[PDB]
Short mmCIF file of all heavy atoms in Angstrom, two decimals:
data_model
loop_
_atom_site.label_atom_id
_atom_site.label_comp_id
_atom_site.label_asym_id
_atom_site.label_seq_id
_atom_site.Cartn_x
_atom_site.Cartn_y
_atom_site.Cartn_z
N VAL A 15 -33.53 -16.23 -28.87
CA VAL A 15 -32.78 -15.03 -28.50
C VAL A 15 -32.98 -14.79 -27.01
O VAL A 15 -33.70 -15.55 -26.36
CB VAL A 15 -33.23 -13.83 -29.35
CG1 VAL A 15 -32.56 -13.88 -30.71
CG2 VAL A 15 -34.73 -13.82 -29.50
N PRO A 16 -32.33 -13.78 -26.41
CA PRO A 16 -32.59 -13.45 -25.00
C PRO A 16 -34.07 -13.27 -24.71
O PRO A 16 -34.88 -13.14 -25.64
CB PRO A 16 -31.81 -12.14 -24.82
CG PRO A 16 -30.63 -12.33 -25.68
CD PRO A 16 -31.07 -13.18 -26.87
N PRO A 17 -34.46 -13.19 -23.42
CA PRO A 17 -35.75 -13.76 -23.00
C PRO A 17 -36.22 -14.95 -23.82
O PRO A 17 -35.41 -15.80 -24.20
CB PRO A 17 -36.68 -12.55 -23.11
CG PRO A 17 -35.71 -11.35 -22.73
CD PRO A 17 -34.28 -11.93 -22.69
N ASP A 58 -25.06 -22.44 -32.22
CA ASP A 58 -25.85 -22.75 -31.03
C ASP A 58 -27.34 -22.70 -31.37
O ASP A 58 -28.08 -21.77 -31.02
CB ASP A 58 -25.46 -21.83 -29.88
CG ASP A 58 -25.49 -20.35 -30.25
OD1 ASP A 58 -26.53 -19.81 -30.67
OD2 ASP A 58 -24.43 -19.70 -30.11
N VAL A 436 -39.44 -2.79 -23.52
CA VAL A 436 -38.60 -3.98 -23.54
C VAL A 436 -37.41 -3.76 -24.47
O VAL A 436 -36.26 -4.06 -24.12
CB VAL A 436 -39.42 -5.21 -23.96
CG1 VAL A 436 -38.73 -6.48 -23.50
CG2 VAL A 436 -40.83 -5.12 -23.40
N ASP A 437 -37.66 -3.22 -25.66
CA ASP A 437 -36.62 -3.06 -26.67
C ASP A 437 -35.57 -2.02 -26.28
O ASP A 437 -34.47 -2.04 -26.84
CB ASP A 437 -37.24 -2.69 -28.02
CG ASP A 437 -38.05 -3.82 -28.61
OD1 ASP A 437 -38.14 -4.89 -27.98
OD2 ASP A 437 -38.61 -3.63 -29.71
N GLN A 438 -35.88 -1.13 -25.35
CA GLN A 438 -34.93 -0.09 -24.97
C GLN A 438 -33.82 -0.61 -24.06
O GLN A 438 -33.09 0.21 -23.49
CB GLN A 438 -35.66 1.06 -24.28
CG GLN A 438 -36.51 1.89 -25.22
CD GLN A 438 -37.79 2.37 -24.56
OE1 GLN A 438 -37.90 2.39 -23.34
NE2 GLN A 438 -38.77 2.74 -25.38
N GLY A 439 -33.67 -1.92 -23.93
CA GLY A 439 -32.58 -2.48 -23.14
C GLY A 439 -31.58 -3.25 -23.98
O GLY A 439 -30.61 -3.80 -23.44
N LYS A 440 -31.81 -3.31 -25.29
CA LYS A 440 -30.97 -4.10 -26.17
C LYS A 440 -29.66 -3.38 -26.48
O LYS A 440 -29.63 -2.17 -26.69
CB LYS A 440 -31.71 -4.41 -27.47
CG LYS A 440 -33.12 -4.94 -27.26
CD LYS A 440 -33.46 -6.03 -28.25
CE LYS A 440 -33.59 -5.48 -29.66
NZ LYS A 440 -34.60 -4.39 -29.74
N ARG A 441 -28.57 -4.15 -26.49
CA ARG A 441 -27.28 -3.60 -26.88
C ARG A 441 -27.27 -3.26 -28.37
O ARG A 441 -27.92 -3.91 -29.18
CB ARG A 441 -26.16 -4.59 -26.56
CG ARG A 441 -25.90 -4.76 -25.07
CD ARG A 441 -25.19 -3.55 -24.51
NE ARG A 441 -24.68 -3.79 -23.16
CZ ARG A 441 -25.38 -3.59 -22.05
NH1 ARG A 441 -26.63 -3.16 -22.09
NH2 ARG A 441 -24.82 -3.83 -20.87
N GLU A 444 -25.87 -5.92 -30.38
CA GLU A 444 -26.82 -7.03 -30.41
C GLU A 444 -28.12 -6.59 -31.09
O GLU A 444 -29.21 -6.66 -30.52
CB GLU A 444 -27.07 -7.53 -28.99
CG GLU A 444 -27.10 -9.03 -28.83
CD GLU A 444 -27.80 -9.44 -27.55
OE1 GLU A 444 -28.35 -8.56 -26.86
OE2 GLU A 444 -27.80 -10.65 -27.23
N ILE C 2 -34.92 -15.01 -16.10
CA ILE C 2 -34.37 -14.58 -17.38
C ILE C 2 -32.94 -15.07 -17.59
O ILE C 2 -32.46 -15.07 -18.73
CB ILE C 2 -34.43 -13.04 -17.50
CG1 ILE C 2 -34.64 -12.63 -18.95
CG2 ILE C 2 -33.18 -12.40 -16.93
CD1 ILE C 2 -35.01 -11.17 -19.11
N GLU C 4 -30.15 -17.75 -18.21
CA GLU C 4 -30.04 -19.08 -18.78
C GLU C 4 -28.73 -19.73 -18.36
O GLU C 4 -27.73 -19.06 -18.12
CB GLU C 4 -30.13 -19.02 -20.31
CG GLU C 4 -31.14 -18.01 -20.83
CD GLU C 4 -31.29 -18.08 -22.34
OE1 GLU C 4 -30.61 -18.91 -22.97
OE2 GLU C 4 -32.09 -17.30 -22.89
N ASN C 23 -27.12 -13.55 -17.94
CA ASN C 23 -28.17 -12.79 -18.61
C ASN C 23 -27.67 -12.43 -20.00
O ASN C 23 -26.87 -11.50 -20.17
CB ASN C 23 -28.53 -11.54 -17.82
CG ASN C 23 -29.89 -11.00 -18.18
OD1 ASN C 23 -30.38 -11.20 -19.29
ND2 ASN C 23 -30.52 -10.29 -17.24
N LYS C 24 -28.13 -13.16 -21.02
CA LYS C 24 -27.67 -12.92 -22.38
C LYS C 24 -28.17 -11.60 -22.95
O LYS C 24 -27.70 -11.19 -24.01
CB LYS C 24 -28.09 -14.07 -23.28
CG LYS C 24 -27.13 -15.24 -23.24
CD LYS C 24 -27.86 -16.56 -23.10
CE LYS C 24 -26.95 -17.72 -23.45
NZ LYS C 24 -27.68 -18.80 -24.17
N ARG C 25 -29.10 -10.93 -22.27
CA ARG C 25 -29.57 -9.63 -22.74
C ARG C 25 -28.61 -8.52 -22.33
O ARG C 25 -28.08 -7.80 -23.19
CB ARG C 25 -30.97 -9.35 -22.20
CG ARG C 25 -31.74 -8.35 -23.03
CD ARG C 25 -33.24 -8.60 -22.95
NE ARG C 25 -33.99 -7.66 -23.77
CZ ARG C 25 -34.03 -6.34 -23.58
NH1 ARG C 25 -33.41 -5.77 -22.56
NH2 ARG C 25 -34.71 -5.59 -24.43
N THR C 26 -28.40 -8.35 -21.03
CA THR C 26 -27.54 -7.28 -20.55
C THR C 26 -26.08 -7.51 -20.92
O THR C 26 -25.35 -6.55 -21.18
CB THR C 26 -27.68 -7.13 -19.04
OG1 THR C 26 -27.30 -8.35 -18.40
CG2 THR C 26 -29.12 -6.81 -18.67
N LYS C 27 -25.63 -8.76 -20.94
CA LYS C 27 -24.25 -9.11 -21.26
C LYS C 27 -24.23 -10.11 -22.40
O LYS C 27 -24.23 -11.33 -22.17
CB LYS C 27 -23.52 -9.66 -20.04
CG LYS C 27 -23.40 -8.69 -18.88
CD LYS C 27 -22.86 -7.35 -19.33
CE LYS C 27 -22.60 -6.44 -18.15
NZ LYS C 27 -23.53 -6.72 -17.03
N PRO C 28 -24.23 -9.64 -23.65
CA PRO C 28 -24.05 -10.56 -24.79
C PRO C 28 -22.61 -10.98 -25.03
O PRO C 28 -22.37 -11.77 -25.95
CB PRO C 28 -24.59 -9.73 -25.97
CG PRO C 28 -25.25 -8.52 -25.37
CD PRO C 28 -24.56 -8.28 -24.09
N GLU C 29 -21.66 -10.48 -24.25
CA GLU C 29 -20.26 -10.82 -24.44
C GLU C 29 -19.97 -12.24 -23.95
O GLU C 29 -20.78 -12.86 -23.25
CB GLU C 29 -19.36 -9.83 -23.72
CG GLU C 29 -19.43 -8.40 -24.24
CD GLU C 29 -20.64 -7.64 -23.74
OE1 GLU C 29 -21.54 -8.26 -23.13
OE2 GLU C 29 -20.70 -6.40 -23.94
N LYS C 30 -18.80 -12.75 -24.33
CA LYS C 30 -18.40 -14.11 -23.98
C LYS C 30 -17.53 -14.09 -22.74
O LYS C 30 -16.48 -13.43 -22.72
CB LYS C 30 -17.67 -14.77 -25.15
CG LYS C 30 -18.57 -15.09 -26.33
CD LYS C 30 -19.24 -16.44 -26.17
CE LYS C 30 -20.45 -16.57 -27.08
NZ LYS C 30 -21.51 -15.58 -26.74
N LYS C 50 -22.33 -23.34 -24.98
CA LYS C 50 -23.69 -23.81 -24.75
C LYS C 50 -23.72 -25.01 -23.81
O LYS C 50 -24.78 -25.40 -23.31
CB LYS C 50 -24.37 -24.17 -26.07
CG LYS C 50 -23.58 -25.16 -26.91
CD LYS C 50 -24.32 -25.49 -28.20
CE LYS C 50 -25.74 -25.94 -27.91
NZ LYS C 50 -25.77 -27.22 -27.15
#
Side-chain angles (χ1 to χ4, degrees):
Chain A
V15 280
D58 52 58
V436 201
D437 292 0
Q438 289 143 19
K440 311 219 291 304
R441 290 287 191 272
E444 223 199 6
Chain C
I2 212 167
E4 321 186 0
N23 200 334
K24 276 134 164 217
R25 203 151 181 297
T26 60
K27 298 310 186 330
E29 296 80 349
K30 290 274 162 297
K50 54 179 307 295

